[PDB]
Design a protein around this ligand. Structure first.
Ligand code: HEM
Ligand code: HEM
Lengths: 727, 727
C-alpha cells in the first residue's frame, strides 16, 4: 500500500552518524561511496528491491502474498499452491550448521596497506609496495558459545582476517591472546569438549565456569598460560576495537633469495587496549547480549573505523634454539622485551556487510590459506589445523565449492582442472579436465617459483627422526610463562585475575577439582595461589607453601607489554557517555558538555525516565535516546549529570542506581551544580574524590577533567571503596 | 593414570538429591531404575564406557591419545596418522543445522495415562484405557533465539509432546499461549523474519524489542492478541513446570461410530502458574542463561517431576458457528467461561536424557503426526504446518530416515514399501518393494478403518467453494480477544503488560512505528493505550480518545482463567530458598528453617561470602553452595537470613544487595534475630510490612508465615514501594 511515513523518517541518512541517531542499515545503503576491489566485485550478486515486483524464485509475479490457496475461503489448503510451497520450503531450509568453534562472531569489510616494501624478508605480493592496497574481510568472535550466545562472556576472542591478494587469498586466523591452551592438535577435541557445554544436559553456554573445563585444566598444566590470560580482564574486552590480535604460531617469511625468517604476527589496536570488569561483563550478557556486534557495526556507521597495525616479531633461523622455551610451542609467547614487534602496515575496517548470513555466516577462513612468500613451521598445533578447516567446510557450507560463495571468492584469477561438486557455479570451457594434456596445449599451466608471480614451493626444511607419536621434551615446561604473565600485571589486574579464578572455581561442583587447580596455581606463584585458596576457603599445605617458583623467562621478571594498562594507550574517540536528563536542563551545561565531547569524537546518549522529549530551560527541545533502565550504565564509558531541575530525578530509583552501577564498575562520573546532590547516593566525600568530576557548572575545566579520566578508561583507585556499595 | 579422587566424590549418588547437592549426570546413571517402554527400547543403542579400552570408531585400540604421528618429535605431522584424522574429522562434522524456529529447548522423558476411557468421543488407542500407559518425550523451548541463546527472555514458549502409542506416534506440538500471532501459514516466514534478528546485522538475539517486529505488528492487527500475551508476565515464565500449554488449533476427535467432535488441547501445570518480573528475567539472561534448562533437569533429579493434566475443550459439530469468532481462527481463544476444559489424563516427566545432542537436539516433532481417532480441521495456519515439519527435517536431520534416529523411533511396529535414502538403518527382507504385489502375497497389507487397530481414514468433511487465495471474512476481527485478555488480568498484571510494551517500544528506533502501535492499542482499550503513550512521551489525539472499544466476546467482560494469578494455584514443592550464612550461625534457627522447608519439599541453598565451609554455634560444619555474587537472588524464590554473628555480613555489599534485589523483585524475605538489622537496607517500616517475615528467632510461626508467602509466589502489594529503591 503505503507504508512509509510521508516524512521519510523510515530511512537512515547515507552519511556517518553517531550511535543511536538513526536506524542502522546494510553497508551498501548506509555508505554507498565506500568501495574497494572486493566490495566492487560483490556487485554482481547484490540484489536491490525498491520498485521491483514481488515474485517466486522462478520470476513469476505474486498477486496475493497474504493467503494460501484453498477450496472455499474456509476450506482446506490445496497441494497445487506452488507459491506457498516454494516460500515455506525456502524458509524451512534457511539454517546451515554453525561453526564448530567460534560460532559467535561479527564481521566487517576494510582494506590493508603496508608502510614500506618488505621485499628483503618476504616475496609476499601484498607486502611488496606501500601503494598496493589489499581488500580485507575480518571476523571477530568468541570461542565456546553458539551463534546465538552472548558477546561479553569471559572467553578467548577470535580475530580472523581474509586478505584478497593479487597472488591468492591469505587468511590470517588468530586470537586475542598470544598463546593457545594446548600443544598438539590431536587434543583439540578433548580441550574443546571440556570447555563446551557438558554433554548430558548441554550447560553451560558461553562459559568455562564448570567442572569439565577445570578438570581438564587441572590434569593438563600446558593449559595454564592461556588460562591466566582468560582469567585476566583480557577475557572480557570492551570492544573488538580495543583488544590485541596474534597469529600465535611461529610461521616463516620466505624472500626471493629463498631465505627463511621465523615470524609471529601481531595486530595492535589503534583505539588502545581496554576491558570491562567481570560484574559489568556478566550483567551486560543479559542487558544486551549483542553488545560487541552492535558497537562494532555502529562504530563503522559513525566513522570510528576500527584500525589495527600489523606487526612482526622476527627471528633469524640461527636463533631458533636460543630461548628458554621452544619457538614451535604454541603455549609459549615471545616476550616483546626480547624480540620487539616491528610495525608492518595498517588495516582499516570501514564498511559493514549487506546481509549477515550471506557474507558473515558463510565466510570461510583457513590458516592453511597462505601465498608464496609465507610458509609453515612444525608447530604441532598448527600442523593439525591445516587438516581441519577444509574438512569442516565441506559439511558446514555444503560441498567443495565454498570458494565460489561470493564473500569467499578470490579477486585474482583462479584456473585448474577441478570439476563438479555440489552447487558448482563456474562453467568450465576447457576441453581438458586433466594435466598433462595436449588437447588444450596443457593450459592452465604450472608456474616455476620466482621473485614475483611464481608458483608456490615449500621451503626445503630438513626433516630427521623416526615416525613417532611423541611430545617434544622441549615443550615440557608449563609454569614460567604463566608466572611471567602474572608478574607483569598491575596490582588491580592481579586482583581481577584472582577474582576470575575464584568466581570460576566457585562454580565447579566437585571440590577436589578446585583443590587440584589451586595446587597448580601454587606452582606458578604463591601470592596468587593463596589469594584464590582464601576465596575458596581452602588452606595450602606446608609443601604447597614450599614449591619453588619456576625460573624467569630468559632473565625477565616482567614485561609491561603483557599488561592491558601498565603503559597508557587510551583513546577516547568512539567512546560514549550517558547524560542523565531532567525536565528543565540548564542548556548552558548541555552545550558545554556536548561540544567538548564532539571535539574529541566522544558520543553521547540523552537518557530520561520516559521516551519522547523534554524541554531545556531556554526552550531547546531535547529528544530522548532511551530510558535509564533501557540503556544501562553497562553500555557506556562514563556518566554526566547536568544541572537543571534535579528534584525531578533526585528520587528516581533507576536514576540513582544508574550512578551506583557506573560507580561500582569504576567509570568516571561528572556532576554539575545541583547534580552534586547525587554524591550522597554514591557516599562520596564532601571534599570530593579522584574519579568524580564536580563543579558549580559544566564549564571550563569540568569537561577537560572528565575527558582525562576517560582517557585512562577506569578509576582503578576506587576499587577498595566499591566493596561496601550494595549494587 | 588417573583418577578419580580415592573418596569417590567425583560420582553423584544414584538417588534423588536436591538442586546443587551433587553434580548432575546422564539420566540412566542418575536414575537407573526409572523405566518405561521407550526408555527400555533405547537400551540397544546406549553405550557405556567404564572398563573399556579407548578405540577408533573401527574398534582399533589407541595406545597414545595425546600426540599426532610425526617424523621426529619436533617434526611435521604425517598424513598416515589415521587415528588423528578420524578423531579431528568426527569433531569437524559435529554440528547439524539448528531448528529454524524453537532452536533453544530443553527436554525430558516421562509417561502419560488417561483418567478414564474416552471411547465415547474418540477411538484413539492411547486414550482408550486408564491403565494403558504411554511413554512420552517432551521438549520445551523458546521461539526466536538460537540453540545457544538464553532461557529467560521475553518470548512465546513451545511445549511439544511425543506420545509413543500402540497405534503410532502422536505429536502434540503446542505453545504456552492459547493463540498464535498470525492466521495463515503463508505469512509464517514474514512474521518469523520480522521477530528474528534483523538481516543486515543479525541483531537482536532472543528479543522482539526491535523495529522490524513492531513494524510488522503495527501493520498486521491480527497479531495483537498473541502480542498481549507476550507482553504480559506469560512471556517470562518462572519455569517450564509453571506455565500452561495449548495445541492452539481446533482439531477433531473421531469415535468408533464416525462422529466428529471439535477439540482444543490444554495442559495444566500441577506445580501452578508462575512467572518472573521483567527486570529479574532480563538480568537472569546474563547471570544464568541456562536457568530454565538447569531448573528442569534438577527438578527431575530431585524427584520434583513436572506434572501436567491434559484437558480438552469439546465443541459439538453443530456448534461450529455459534461463537462471535471463528473456531478455525488461531488468533482467537475459546474462553473457559464458555467451553470449560474437561480433565483427560496426567503426564509425568521423571527422567532426563543421557546425551543432549542425541535425544534432545535430534528429536523431531510434527503436528501432522496424528493417529486413528484424531483428525485435522481447515484452520489455515494448521493446514500449512502440515507441509513444513517433514520438509524442514530432511535437511536438519539429513535425509528421509529421521524416524530411524533412536529418540524418534516408534515403539509399535512399522512396515511399508519405502526404501533407501541417506543413512538407511533398516534392512528390508521383503522380496517386494511395491504394492500390489503377488511375490510377497501382498504383505505388508492395508487395514480397513474400524473401532480399534484399524487403518487411518479421514473424516469425510464436506468441501464447497472455489479455488481462492482469500482470508475468511469471519477472521477479520482483531481487538475483542486482546481486550478480553486485558480486562481479565489483575491490576499488577495490567501494569506489567503496560511496562512490557513500554520497554519494547522504547527500543524501536523509528518513532512513527511506536506511534502506529500506540494507535492499535487505542482500538483495544484506552487505559492501556494512554499508560503506554505516557511512558513513550506520546499524546493521544482526540480521535484516538474516541475510538469505540470492541464488543465483549459472547457477552464476557472477563474470564479469570486468562490471568496467571487471580485464582490462587500456588505450589511450593520444588521451589528454592537462599539462606545467607554468617560465620557463627545460630544452629537452632537453621534447624527450624530446614525442617520446615523439608516438610513442604522446598529446597535451600547455603550462601556465603566465600566457598568452603563455616561452623555454626554448635560446631556443625556447613558446606557452602555458592557465594552471594555467584548465585544471585534472581535464582531463588525467597530469602532467609538466620541469626548468628550478623556483624560478619552486615557491611558486606553483596549481602545487602542480595536483599535489595530480592526485595525489588517482590520475593518473600525472612529475617531472624539480629538479621532484622538488614531492615534498614531495604528501608522498610520499624513496625514491619506484609511480605517481610521477622521475629526474635526462626521458630514456630516464622516458617509458616514464610511458606504462606511462598505459596502466593510474589508480594504484589510491594509494587508501589520498589520504584524508589535504587537496585
Ligand atoms: C592457535 C590456535 C588456534 C587459533 C588462533 C584458532 C582460531 C580460530 C578462529 C579465529 C576461528 C573462526 C574463523 C571465523 O571467524 O570463521 C576458528 C575456527 C575453527 N577452528 Fe581454529 N584456532 C586454533 C586452533 C584450532 C585447532 C587445533 C583446530 C583443529 C585441529 C581448529 C579447528 C577449527 C575449526 C574446525 C574451526 C571452524 C572453521 C569453519 O567452520 O570455517 N582450530 N579458529
Ligand atoms: C499454532 C501455531 C504453532 C505452534 C503451536 C508451533 C509450535 C512449534 C514448536 C513447539 C516447535 C518445536 C518442536 C521441538 O521442540 O522440536 C515448532 C517447530 C517448528 N515449527 Fe511450528 N508452531 C506453530 C506454527 C508454525 C507454522 C505456521 C509453521 C510453518 C508453516 C511452523 C514451522 C515450524 C518448523 C519448520 C519448525 C522446526 C521443526 C524441526 O526442525 O523439527 N510452525 N513449532
Amino acid at each position: 500500500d503505503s507504508l512509509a511515513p510521508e516524512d521519510g523518517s523510515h530511512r537512515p541518512a547515507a552519511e556517518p552518524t553517531p550511535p543511536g541517531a538513526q536506524p542502522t542499515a546494510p553497508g551498501s545503503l548506509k555508505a554507498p561511496d565506500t568501495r574497494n576491489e572486493k566490495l566492487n566485485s560483490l556487485e554482481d550478486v547484490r540484489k536491490g528491491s525498491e520498485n521491483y515486483a514481488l515474485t517466486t524464485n522462478q520470476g513469476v509475479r505474486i498477486a496475493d502474498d497474504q493467503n494460501s490457496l484453498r477450496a472455499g475461503s474456509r476450506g482446506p489448503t490445496l497441494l497445487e499452491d506452488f507459491i506457498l510451497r516454494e516460500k515455506i520450503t525456502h524458509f524451512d531450509h534457511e539454517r546451515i550448521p554453525e561453526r564448530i568453534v567460534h560460532a559467535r562472531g561479527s564481521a566487517a569489510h576494510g582494506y590493508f596497506q603496508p608502510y614500506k616494501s618488505l621485499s628483503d624478508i618476504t616475496k609476499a605480493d601484498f607486502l611488496s609496495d606501500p601503494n598496493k592496497i589489499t581488500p580485507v574481510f575480518v571476523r571477530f568472535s568468541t570461542v565456546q558459545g553458539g551463534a546465538g550466545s552472548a558477546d561479553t562472556v569471559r572467553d578467548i576472542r577470535g580475530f580472523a582476517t581474509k586478505f584478497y591478494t593479487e597472488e591468492g587469498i591469505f587468511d590470517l586466523v588468530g586470537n586475542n591472546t598470544p598463546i593457545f591452551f594446548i600443544q598438539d592438535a590431536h587434543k583439540f577435541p578433548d580441550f574443546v569438549h571440556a570447555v563446551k557445554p557438558e554433554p548430558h544436559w548441554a550447560i553451560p553456554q558461553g562459559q568455562s565456569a564448570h567442572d569439565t573445563f577445570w578438570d581438564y585444566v587441572s590434569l593438563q598444566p600446558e593449559t595454564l598460560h592461556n588460562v591466566m590470560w582468560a582469567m585476566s580482564d583480557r577475557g572480557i574486552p570492551r570492544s573488538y576495537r580495543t583488544m590485541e590480535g596474534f597469529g600465535i604460531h611461529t610461521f616463516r617469511l620466505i624472500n626471493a633469495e629463498g631465505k627463511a625468517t621465523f615470524v609471529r604476527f601481531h595486530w595492535k589496536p589503534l583505539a588502545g587496549k581496554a576491558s570491562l570488569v567481570w560484574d559489568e561483563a556478566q550483567k551486560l550478557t543479559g542487558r544486551d547480549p549483542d553488545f560487541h556486534r552492535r558497537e562494532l557495526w555502529e562504530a563503522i556507521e559513525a566513522g570510528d573505523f576500527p584500525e589495527y597495525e600489523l606487526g612482526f616479531q622476527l627471528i633469524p633461523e640461527e636463533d631458533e634454539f636460543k630461548f628458554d622455551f621452544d619457538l614451535l610451542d604454541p603455549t609459549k609467547l615471545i616476550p616483546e622485551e626480547l624480540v620487539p614487534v616491528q610495525r608492518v602496515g595498517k588495516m582499516v575496517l570501514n564498511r559493514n556487510p549487506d546481509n549477515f548470513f550471506a557474507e558473515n555466516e558463510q565466510a570461510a577462513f583457513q590458516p592453511g590459506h597462505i601465498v608464496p612468500g609465507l610458509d609453515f613451521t612444525n608447530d604441532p598445533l598448527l600442523q593439525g589445523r591445516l587438516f581441519s578447516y577444509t574438512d569442516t567446510q565441506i559439511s558446514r557450507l555444503g560441498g567443495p565449492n565454498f570458494h565460489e560463495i561470493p564473500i569467499n571468492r578470490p579477486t585474482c584469477p583462479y584456473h585448474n582442472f577441478q570439476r563438479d561438486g555440489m552447487h558448482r557455479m563456474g562453467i568450465d570451457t576447457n576441453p581438458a579436465n586433466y594435466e598433462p594434456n595436449s588437447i588444450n596445449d596443457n593450459w592452465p599451466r604450472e608456474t616455476p617459483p620466482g621473485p614475483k608471480r611464481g608458483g608456490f614451493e615449500s621451503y626445503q626444511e630438513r626433516v630427521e627422526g623416526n615416525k613417532v607419536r611423541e611430545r617434544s621434551p622441549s615443550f615440557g615446561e608449563y609454569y614460567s610463562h604463566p608466572r611471567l604473565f602474572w608478574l607483569s600485571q598491575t596490582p588491580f589486574e592481579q586482583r581481577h585475575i584472582v577474582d576470575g579464578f575464584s568466581f570460576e572455581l566457585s562454580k565447579v561442583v566437585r571440590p577436589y577439582i578446585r583443590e587440584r587447580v589451586v595446587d597448580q596455581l601454587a606452582h606458578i606463584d604463591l601470592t596468587l595461589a593463596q589469594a584464590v585458596a582464601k576465596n575458596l576457603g581452602i588452606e595450602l599445605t606446608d609443601d604447597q607453601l614450599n614449591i619453588t617458583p619456576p625460573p624467569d623467562v630468559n632473565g625477565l621478571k616482567k614485561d609491561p607489554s603483557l599488561s592491558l594498562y601498565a603503559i597508557p594507550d587510551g583513546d577516547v574517540k568512539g567512546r560514549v557517555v550517558a547524560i542523565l536528563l531532567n525536565d528543565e536542563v540548564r542548556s548552558a551545561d548541555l552545550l558545554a558538555i556536548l561540544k567538548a565531547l564532539k571535539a574529541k569524537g566522544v558520543h553521547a546518549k540523552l537518557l530520561y525516565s520516559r521516551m519522547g522529549e523534554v524541554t531545556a530551560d531556554d526552550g531547546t527541545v531535547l529528544p530522548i535516546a532511551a530510558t535509564f533502565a533501557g540503556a544501562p550504565s553497562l553500555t557506556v564509558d562514563a556518566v554526566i549529570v547536568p544541572c537543571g531541575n534535579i528534584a525531578d530525578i533526585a528520587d528516581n530509583g533507576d536514576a540513582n542506581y544508574y550512578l551506583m552501577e557506573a560507580y561500582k564498575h569504576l567509570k568516571p562520573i561528572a556532576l554539575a551544580g545541583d547534580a552534586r546532590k547525587f554524591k550522597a547516593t554514591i557516599k562520596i566525600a564532601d571534599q570530593g574524590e579522584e574519579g568524580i568530576v564536580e563543579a558549580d557548572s559544566a564549564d571550563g575545566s569540568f569537561m577537560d577533567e572528565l575527558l582525562t579520566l576517560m582517557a585512562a578508561h577506569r578509576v582503578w583507585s576506587r576499587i577498595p571503596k566499591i566493596d561496601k556499595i550494595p549494587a
